[PDB]
Amino acid sequence: GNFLKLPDTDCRQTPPFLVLLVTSSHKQLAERMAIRQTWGKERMVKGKQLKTFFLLGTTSSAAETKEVDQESQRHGDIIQKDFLDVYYNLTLKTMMGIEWVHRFCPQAAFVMKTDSDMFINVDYLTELLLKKNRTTRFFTGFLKLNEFPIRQPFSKWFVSKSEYPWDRYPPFCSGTGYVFSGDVASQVYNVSKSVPYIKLEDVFVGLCLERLNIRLEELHSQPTFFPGGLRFSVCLFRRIVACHFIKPRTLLDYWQALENSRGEDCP
Ligand SMILES: CC(=O)N[C@H]1[C@H](O[C@H]2[C@@H](O)[C@@H](CO)O[C@H](O[C@@H]3[C@H](O)[C@@H](O)[C@H](O[C@H]4[C@H](O)[C@@H](O)[C@H](O)O[C@@H]4CO)O[C@@H]3CO)[C@@H]2O)O[C@H](CO)[C@H](O)[C@@H]1O
Ligand SMILES: *[C@@H]1O[C@H](CO)[C@@H](O[C@@H]2O[C@H](CO)[C@@H](O)[C@H](O)[C@H]2NC(C)=O)[C@H](O)[C@H]1NC(C)=O
Ligand SMILES: O=c1ccn([C@@H]2O[C@H](COP(=O)(O)OP(=O)(O)O)[C@@H](O)[C@H]2O)c(=O)[nH]1
Numbered sequence: 001g002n003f004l005k006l007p008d009t010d011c012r013q014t015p016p017f018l019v020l021l022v023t024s025s026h027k028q029l030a031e032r033m034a035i036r037q038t039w040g041k042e043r044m045v046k047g048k049q050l051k052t053f054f055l056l057g058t059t060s061s062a063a064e065t066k067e068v069d070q071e072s073q074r075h076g077d078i079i080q081k082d083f084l085d086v087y088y089n090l091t092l093k094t095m096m097g098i099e100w101v102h103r104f105c106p107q108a109a110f111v112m113k114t115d116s117d118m119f120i121n122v123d124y125l126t127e128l129l130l131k132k133n134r135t136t137r138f139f140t141g142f143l144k145l146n147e148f149p150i151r152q153p154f155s156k157w158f159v160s161k162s163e164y165p166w167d168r169y170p171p172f173c174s175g176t177g178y179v180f181s182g183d184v185a186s187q188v189y190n191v192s193k194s195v196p197y198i199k200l201e202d203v204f205v206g207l208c209l210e211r212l213n214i215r216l217e218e219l220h221s222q223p224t225f226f227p228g229g230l231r232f233s234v235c236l237f238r239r240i241v242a243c244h245f246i247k248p249r250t251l252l253d254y255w256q257a258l259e260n261s262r263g264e265d266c267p
């Protein structure tokens with residue numbers, strides 16, 4: 001479907017249990033390298049395969065274009081299509097990832113769309129998913145159930161009435177990190193063209209899920225996704241799935257902390 005870059009992976013041969021799709025700008029190489037050394041490292045988690053890919057569009061900068069071309073050649077984990085990669089095109093970026101799952105990895109049991117300024121505890125996520133007994137039409141994350149369109153003209157999430165004309169948004173999950181069973185990717189790509197467009201990608205996916213009659217559900221009896229960020233501790237971070245507001249160096253320091261304290265017990 002018009003992909004400029006496709007990861008060197010074969011999901012039919014080796015169906016992944018969890019596929020991470022990470023959004024990042026071309027200049028955010030430091031982010032991607034920190035993820036590649038930390039929670040993005042492909043591995044078997046409780047015998048389940050984890051795969052990690054980075055979603056990119058295109059840019060006017062020839063330098064960044066060449067950098068990203070070289071990165072794809074060294075890492076082979078970039079999914080790319082020809083759309084201008086800017087904040088207000090994040091919906092295209094998300095739909096590219098969903099399209100990739102639909103076309104090339106329908107075998108994925110679960111797919112997590114995540115941001116680059118994030119800590120992800122794949123071990124705990126896998127444990128909770130294996131416990132949920134939900135393999136189809138499943139969608140979870142930080143649930144946002146009574147959200148009102150931001151009508152402040154200079155806010156990053158401002159939508160005019162012509163862009164979104166209704167008083168409330170549909171149920172949706174924060175775009176920081178959301179997880180869905182792999183079949184969900186095909187149903188969304190299908191109805192995508194008939195659902196009203198909105199430039200906020202997490203609201204757009206919510207509109208698609210609503211059209212599909214897919215209901216959001218909490219992953220666990222306790223909160224596990226933290227779009228607002230968290231005060232760090234080893235024992236807390238062992239029992240969460242996702243935390244936002246995390247810069248590259250902090251992610252390496254947190255990952256080192258968890259490695260250093262492996263084998264220590266927590267209340
Ligand atoms: C991370 C996330 O979920 N982003 C979504 C954004 O979620 C925000 C939304 O729910 C609002 C509505 O009450 O609450 C939180 O945001 C607060 C403010 O409403 C929001 O404007 C502000 O954002 C910036 C603010 O405009 C500036 O004045 C300030 O200087 O900087 C703020 C940060 O950049 O943030 C506060 C607390 O974060 C939620 O975070 O909602 C949109 C839809 O409107 C979309 O779903 C995003 O995914
Ligand atoms: C999102 O990406 C699309 C595709 O790259 C942009 O649309 C193109 O915009 C360029 C100028 O930036 C035009 O020359 C093309 O004719 C457009 N093509 C298509 C197919 O749309 C779009 O401008 C980007 N959105 C934002 C907000 O930057
Ligand atoms: O052109 C852009 C701008 C942003 N992002 C990604 O979009 C996510 C959210 O952007 P940011 O963290 O700046 O904003 P937030 O929504 O957290 O306030 C991050 O993964 C960014 O790397 C992207 O892929 N391309």
Ligand SMILES: *[C@@H]1O[C@H](CO[C@@H]2O[C@@H](C)[C@@H](O)[C@@H](O)[C@@H]2O)[C@@H](O)[C@H](O)[C@H]1NC(C)=O
Pocket residue numbers: 131132133
């Ligand atoms: C998930 O399932 C676990 C295993 O239970 C067995 O399989 C499930 C699918 C049911 O058929 C159940 O009756 C069987 O005993 C349960 O231990 C666990 O509680 C389940 N978790 C949830 C979310 O209920």
Ligand SMILES: [Mn+2]
Pocket residue numbers: 115116117244245
């Ligand atoms: Mn962010």
